[PDB]
Amino acid sequence: LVPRGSHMIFVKNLASVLSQEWSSTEKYPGVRWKFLIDADFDGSSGLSLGFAEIAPGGDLTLHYHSPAEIYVVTNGKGILNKSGKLETIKKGDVVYIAGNAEHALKNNGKETLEFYWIFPTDRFSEVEYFPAKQKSG
Amino acid sequence: LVPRGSHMIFVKNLASVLSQEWSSTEKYPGVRWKFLIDADFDGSSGLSLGFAEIAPGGDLTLHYHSPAEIYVVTNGKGILNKSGKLETIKKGDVVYIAGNAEHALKNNGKETLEFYWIFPTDRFSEVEYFPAKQKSG
Ligand SMILES: [Fe+3]
Ligand SMILES: [Fe+3]
């Protein structure tokens, strides 16, 4: 009645999701993403994954969210802000972001910064995401 | 006293783990792996990730495990066995494996099949893994 087990094995790639529009927000010019493994699209559970592109100059500013997260960097170079301490990331790297850790990603290179993100959640839309500032002045 | 939050953000790559020996087993010639994000090495939690290589001809035979899993295919081509139904996978694909789904991976190509795996567990060593057969005859 409901797919489970091997009935719910599937393969995705960007071509698979050609007819899903890129997601983006006015506040983050130069950042766009698509959802590849997500319960709002697939019915999967336990892990969710998307693919993101940060154009040159793009900036995903300091924030945090309760679940742990992984980035898998597949192209380009970026600057990871580990709550003040900067580290370069590049193709071939993976990144672990502990739960509730303040972090940000900036592309100061000339190529697009491309990466997957993964959460231990059924869907992205369950993630509670907050700006790091938590004050007005 | 214990790192948490942004203190437990880190970046890994294969060079980072150069001094970790490749893992392999006599029963699976042509399969080897390393652990990149794992509580037995890093203290991370919530998600764990490794990198695996399946040489030409290598075969990760039919099995299952209770947590859901993702593969991120970074090079080569393989055959994913979805409990009897075969599907090709290749560079640029992601794979969702539902919890307890019987699955296997074979490299019938000429290049190494290279991929990350991810579980929603603190460590690989917590995963209960079983051969699919569950009978002797
Ligand atoms: Fe994040
Ligand atoms: Fe698996």
CSV table of C-alpha atoms and ligand atoms in Angstrom, one decimal:
chain,number,residue,atom,x,y,z
A,1,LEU,CA,0.0,0.0,0.0
A,2,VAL,CA,3.0,2.2,0.7
A,3,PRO,CA,6.5,1.6,-0.8
A,4,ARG,CA,9.1,0.5,1.6
A,5,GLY,CA,12.4,-1.5,1.6
A,6,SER,CA,13.8,-2.1,-1.9
A,7,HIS,CA,10.7,-0.6,-3.5
A,8,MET,CA,12.1,2.7,-2.1
A,9,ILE,CA,15.5,2.6,-3.6
A,10,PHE,CA,16.1,5.2,-6.2
A,11,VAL,CA,18.7,7.0,-8.2
A,12,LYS,CA,18.7,10.7,-8.9
A,13,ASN,CA,20.9,13.2,-10.8
A,14,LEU,CA,20.4,16.7,-12.1
A,15,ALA,CA,18.9,15.4,-15.3
A,16,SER,CA,16.3,13.5,-13.3
A,17,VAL,CA,15.1,16.8,-11.8
A,18,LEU,CA,15.3,18.9,-14.9
A,19,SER,CA,11.6,19.8,-14.6
A,20,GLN,CA,12.0,20.9,-10.9
A,21,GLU,CA,12.6,24.6,-11.0
A,22,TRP,CA,15.7,25.9,-9.3
A,23,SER,CA,15.0,27.3,-5.9
A,24,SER,CA,16.3,30.7,-5.0
A,25,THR,CA,15.5,33.7,-2.8
A,26,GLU,CA,15.8,37.4,-3.5
A,27,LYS,CA,18.0,37.9,-0.4
A,28,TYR,CA,20.7,35.5,-1.7
A,29,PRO,CA,21.5,36.5,-5.3
A,30,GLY,CA,23.9,33.9,-6.7
A,31,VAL,CA,22.6,31.0,-4.6
A,32,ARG,CA,20.3,28.4,-6.0
A,33,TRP,CA,19.5,24.8,-5.2
A,34,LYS,CA,17.4,21.7,-6.0
A,35,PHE,CA,16.1,18.9,-3.9
A,36,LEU,CA,17.2,15.3,-4.9
A,37,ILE,CA,16.3,13.1,-1.9
A,38,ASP,CA,13.5,14.6,0.1
A,39,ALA,CA,10.2,13.3,1.6
A,40,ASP,CA,8.3,16.3,0.0
A,41,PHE,CA,9.3,14.9,-3.4
A,42,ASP,CA,10.2,11.2,-3.0
A,43,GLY,CA,8.7,9.8,0.2
A,44,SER,CA,12.2,8.8,1.4
A,45,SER,CA,13.0,9.1,5.1
A,46,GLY,CA,15.9,9.3,7.5
A,47,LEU,CA,18.3,11.3,5.3
A,48,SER,CA,17.7,14.2,2.9
A,49,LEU,CA,20.0,15.7,0.3
A,50,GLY,CA,20.1,18.6,-2.2
A,51,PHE,CA,22.4,20.1,-4.7
A,52,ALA,CA,23.5,23.8,-4.4
A,53,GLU,CA,25.4,26.3,-6.5
A,54,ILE,CA,26.9,29.5,-5.2
A,55,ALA,CA,27.9,31.8,-8.0
A,56,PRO,CA,31.1,33.9,-7.8
A,57,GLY,CA,30.5,36.5,-5.1
A,58,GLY,CA,27.6,34.6,-3.5
A,59,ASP,CA,27.3,34.5,0.2
A,60,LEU,CA,25.3,32.2,2.5
A,61,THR,CA,25.6,34.3,5.7
A,62,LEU,CA,26.0,33.2,9.3
A,63,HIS,CA,23.3,30.9,10.5
A,64,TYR,CA,22.6,27.7,12.4
A,65,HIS,CA,20.1,24.8,12.5
A,66,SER,CA,19.5,22.1,15.1
A,67,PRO,CA,20.4,19.0,13.0
A,68,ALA,CA,24.0,18.1,12.0
A,69,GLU,CA,24.8,18.6,8.4
A,70,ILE,CA,27.3,17.5,5.8
A,71,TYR,CA,28.5,19.3,2.7
A,72,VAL,CA,30.1,17.4,-0.2
A,73,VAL,CA,32.0,19.8,-2.3
A,74,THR,CA,32.0,18.8,-6.0
A,75,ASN,CA,33.5,21.8,-7.7
A,76,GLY,CA,35.1,25.2,-7.1
A,77,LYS,CA,36.5,26.8,-4.0
A,78,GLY,CA,34.8,28.6,-1.1
A,79,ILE,CA,35.4,30.1,2.3
A,80,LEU,CA,33.8,28.3,5.2
A,81,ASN,CA,33.2,30.6,8.2
A,82,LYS,CA,33.4,28.4,11.3
A,83,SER,CA,31.8,31.0,13.6
A,84,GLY,CA,34.6,33.5,13.0
A,85,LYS,CA,37.5,31.2,12.0
A,86,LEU,CA,37.8,30.9,8.3
A,87,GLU,CA,38.8,27.8,6.3
A,88,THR,CA,39.0,27.3,2.5
A,89,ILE,CA,37.0,24.4,1.0
A,90,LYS,CA,37.3,23.0,-2.4
A,91,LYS,CA,36.5,20.1,-4.8
A,92,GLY,CA,37.1,16.8,-3.1
A,93,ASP,CA,36.3,18.0,0.5
A,94,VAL,CA,33.6,17.0,2.8
A,95,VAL,CA,32.5,19.3,5.7
A,96,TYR,CA,30.9,18.3,9.0
A,97,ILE,CA,28.7,20.9,10.6
A,98,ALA,CA,27.7,20.0,14.2
A,99,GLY,CA,24.1,20.7,15.3
A,100,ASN,CA,23.5,24.3,16.2
A,101,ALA,CA,27.0,25.4,15.0
A,102,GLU,CA,27.1,28.9,13.5
A,103,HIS,CA,28.4,28.7,9.9
A,104,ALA,CA,28.5,30.4,6.6
A,105,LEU,CA,29.8,29.8,3.1
A,106,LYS,CA,31.2,32.4,0.7
A,107,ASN,CA,32.4,32.0,-2.9
A,108,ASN,CA,35.3,34.3,-3.4
A,109,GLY,CA,36.7,32.4,-6.4
A,110,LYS,CA,36.1,32.7,-10.2
A,111,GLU,CA,34.2,29.4,-10.7
A,112,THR,CA,30.8,28.3,-9.3
A,113,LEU,CA,31.0,26.6,-5.9
A,114,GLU,CA,29.0,23.4,-6.2
A,115,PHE,CA,28.1,21.0,-3.4
A,116,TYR,CA,25.6,18.6,-2.0
A,117,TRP,CA,24.1,19.1,1.4
A,118,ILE,CA,22.8,16.3,3.6
A,119,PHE,CA,20.7,16.3,6.8
A,120,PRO,CA,19.5,13.5,9.0
A,121,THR,CA,15.9,14.5,8.4
A,122,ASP,CA,13.2,13.2,6.2
A,123,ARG,CA,12.9,16.6,4.5
A,124,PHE,CA,14.5,20.0,4.3
A,125,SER,CA,11.2,21.7,5.2
A,126,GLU,CA,11.5,20.2,8.8
A,127,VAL,CA,14.8,22.0,9.5
A,128,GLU,CA,14.6,24.9,11.9
A,129,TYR,CA,17.0,27.5,10.5
A,130,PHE,CA,18.0,30.7,12.3
A,131,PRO,CA,20.3,33.7,11.6
A,132,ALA,CA,23.2,33.7,13.9
A,133,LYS,CA,22.8,37.4,15.1
A,134,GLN,CA,19.8,36.9,17.4
A,135,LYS,CA,19.8,40.7,18.3
A,136,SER,CA,19.0,43.9,16.6
A,137,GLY,CA,21.7,46.0,18.1
B,1,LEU,CA,35.3,20.4,28.3
B,2,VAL,CA,33.9,18.7,25.2
B,3,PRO,CA,33.8,20.3,21.8
B,4,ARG,CA,30.4,21.2,20.5
B,5,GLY,CA,28.8,23.7,18.1
B,6,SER,CA,31.2,25.6,15.9
B,7,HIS,CA,34.2,24.0,17.7
B,8,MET,CA,33.0,20.8,16.0
B,9,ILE,CA,33.0,22.0,12.4
B,10,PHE,CA,35.7,20.4,10.3
B,11,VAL,CA,36.8,19.7,6.8
B,12,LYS,CA,38.1,16.4,5.5
B,13,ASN,CA,39.5,15.1,2.2
B,14,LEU,CA,41.5,12.0,1.2
B,15,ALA,CA,44.7,13.8,1.9
B,16,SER,CA,43.5,14.6,5.5
B,17,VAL,CA,43.3,10.8,6.1
B,18,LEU,CA,46.5,9.8,4.3
B,19,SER,CA,47.7,8.1,7.5
B,20,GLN,CA,44.5,6.1,8.0
B,21,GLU,CA,45.0,2.8,6.4
B,22,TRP,CA,42.5,1.7,3.7
B,23,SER,CA,40.0,-0.7,5.1
B,24,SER,CA,39.3,-3.9,3.2
B,25,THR,CA,38.3,-7.5,3.8
B,26,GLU,CA,39.6,-10.7,2.3
B,27,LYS,CA,36.0,-11.6,1.2
B,28,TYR,CA,35.6,-8.5,-1.0
B,29,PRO,CA,38.7,-8.3,-3.2
B,30,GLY,CA,38.6,-5.0,-5.0
B,31,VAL,CA,36.6,-3.1,-2.4
B,32,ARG,CA,38.3,-0.6,0.0
B,33,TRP,CA,37.2,2.3,2.0
B,34,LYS,CA,38.2,5.1,4.5
B,35,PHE,CA,36.1,6.9,7.1
B,36,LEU,CA,36.0,10.7,6.8
B,37,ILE,CA,33.2,11.8,9.2
B,38,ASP,CA,32.7,9.3,12.0
B,39,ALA,CA,32.5,9.4,15.8
B,40,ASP,CA,35.2,6.7,16.2
B,41,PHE,CA,37.7,9.1,14.6
B,42,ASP,CA,36.2,12.6,15.0
B,43,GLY,CA,33.6,12.8,17.7
B,44,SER,CA,31.0,14.0,15.3
B,45,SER,CA,27.4,12.9,15.6
B,46,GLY,CA,24.2,12.6,13.8
B,47,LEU,CA,25.6,11.8,10.3
B,48,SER,CA,28.6,9.7,9.3
B,49,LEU,CA,30.3,9.4,6.0
B,50,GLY,CA,33.0,7.4,4.3
B,51,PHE,CA,34.7,7.1,0.8
B,52,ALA,CA,34.7,3.8,-1.0
B,53,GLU,CA,36.4,2.4,-4.2
B,54,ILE,CA,35.2,-0.7,-6.0
B,55,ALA,CA,37.8,-1.9,-8.5
B,56,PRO,CA,36.8,-3.3,-11.9
B,57,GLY,CA,35.0,-6.6,-11.2
B,58,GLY,CA,34.4,-5.8,-7.6
B,59,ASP,CA,31.1,-6.8,-6.0
B,60,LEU,CA,29.4,-5.7,-2.8
B,61,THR,CA,26.9,-8.5,-2.6
B,62,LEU,CA,23.2,-8.4,-1.5
B,63,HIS,CA,22.7,-7.1,2.0
B,64,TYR,CA,20.6,-4.8,4.2
B,65,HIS,CA,21.0,-2.6,7.2
B,66,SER,CA,18.4,-0.9,9.4
B,67,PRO,CA,19.3,2.8,8.8
B,68,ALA,CA,18.6,4.6,5.5
B,69,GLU,CA,21.7,5.3,3.4
B,70,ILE,CA,22.9,7.6,0.6
B,71,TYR,CA,25.6,6.9,-2.0
B,72,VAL,CA,27.1,9.9,-3.8
B,73,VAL,CA,28.8,8.6,-7.0
B,74,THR,CA,31.9,10.6,-7.9
B,75,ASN,CA,33.5,8.5,-10.6
B,76,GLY,CA,33.0,5.5,-12.8
B,77,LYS,CA,29.9,3.4,-13.5
B,78,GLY,CA,28.3,0.5,-11.6
B,79,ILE,CA,25.3,-1.7,-11.4
B,80,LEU,CA,23.0,-1.2,-8.5
B,81,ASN,CA,21.0,-4.2,-7.6
B,82,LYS,CA,17.6,-3.1,-6.1
B,83,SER,CA,16.6,-6.5,-4.7
B,84,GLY,CA,16.6,-8.1,-8.1
B,85,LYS,CA,15.9,-5.1,-10.3
B,86,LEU,CA,19.1,-3.7,-11.8
B,87,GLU,CA,19.9,0.0,-12.5
B,88,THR,CA,23.1,1.6,-13.8
B,89,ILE,CA,24.7,4.3,-11.6
B,90,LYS,CA,27.4,6.7,-12.6
B,91,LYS,CA,29.3,9.9,-11.8
B,92,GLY,CA,26.9,12.6,-10.9
B,93,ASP,CA,24.3,10.3,-9.4
B,94,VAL,CA,23.0,10.1,-5.8
B,95,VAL,CA,21.3,6.9,-4.5
B,96,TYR,CA,18.8,6.6,-1.7
B,97,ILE,CA,18.6,3.2,0.0
B,98,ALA,CA,15.6,2.9,2.3
B,99,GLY,CA,16.1,1.3,5.7
B,100,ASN,CA,16.3,-2.5,5.5
B,101,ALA,CA,16.2,-2.5,1.7
B,102,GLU,CA,18.2,-5.4,0.1
B,103,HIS,CA,20.8,-3.9,-2.2
B,104,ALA,CA,24.2,-4.6,-3.8
B,105,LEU,CA,26.7,-2.7,-5.9
B,106,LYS,CA,28.8,-4.2,-8.8
B,107,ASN,CA,31.5,-2.6,-10.9
B,108,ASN,CA,31.3,-4.1,-14.4
B,109,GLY,CA,33.1,-1.1,-16.0
B,110,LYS,CA,36.7,-0.5,-16.8
B,111,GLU,CA,37.3,2.4,-14.4
B,112,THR,CA,37.1,2.4,-10.6
B,113,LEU,CA,33.7,3.0,-9.2
B,114,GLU,CA,34.2,5.7,-6.5
B,115,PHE,CA,31.5,7.0,-4.1
B,116,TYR,CA,30.8,8.4,-0.7
B,117,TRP,CA,28.3,6.7,1.6
B,118,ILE,CA,26.3,8.5,4.3
B,119,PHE,CA,24.3,7.1,7.3
B,120,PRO,CA,22.2,8.9,9.8
B,121,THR,CA,24.3,7.4,12.6
B,122,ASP,CA,27.2,8.8,14.7
B,123,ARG,CA,29.5,6.0,13.5
B,124,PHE,CA,29.7,3.2,11.0
B,125,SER,CA,30.4,0.7,13.7
B,126,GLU,CA,26.8,1.1,15.1
B,127,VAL,CA,25.3,-0.1,11.8
B,128,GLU,CA,23.8,-3.6,12.0
B,129,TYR,CA,24.5,-5.2,8.6
B,130,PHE,CA,23.2,-8.5,7.4
B,131,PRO,CA,23.5,-10.6,4.3
B,132,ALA,CA,20.2,-10.8,2.4
B,133,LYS,CA,20.1,-14.6,2.1
B,134,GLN,CA,19.1,-15.4,5.7
B,135,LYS,CA,18.9,-19.2,4.9
B,136,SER,CA,21.4,-21.9,4.2
B,137,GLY,CA,19.4,-23.8,1.6
C,1,FE,FE,24.4,24.4,6.8
C,2,FE,FE,24.4,0.2,1.7
